[PDB]
Ligand binder design. Structure first.
Ligand SMILES: [Mg+2]
Length: 77
């Protein structure tokens, strides 16, 4: 039972293997996140294909990095 799994599936409402990393940073604004601007530049780190999608390894790399964004995000997962 992983926490990052829930959030990862949160955006994955299309039954896909990846989730848009662009809509995330822009979506966090609704979650009440005050780092939507910092997350936008952070999500780019996990993205190695610079595409509008991220897999489990990508999304995870964000948390494993402990940047300080997913810390508060996963808290409301
Ligand atoms: Mg990617």
């Amino acid at each position: 039972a992983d926490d990052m799994e829930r959030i990862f599936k949160r955006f994955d409402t299309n039954g896909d293997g990846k989730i848009s990393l662009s809509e995330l940073t822009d979506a966090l604004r609704t979650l009440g996140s005050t780092s939507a601007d910092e997350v936008q530049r952070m999500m780019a780190e996990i993205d190695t294909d610079g595409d509008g999608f991220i897999d489990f390894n990508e999304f995870i790399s964000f948390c494993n990095a402990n940047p300080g964004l997913m810390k508060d995000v996963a808290k409301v997962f």
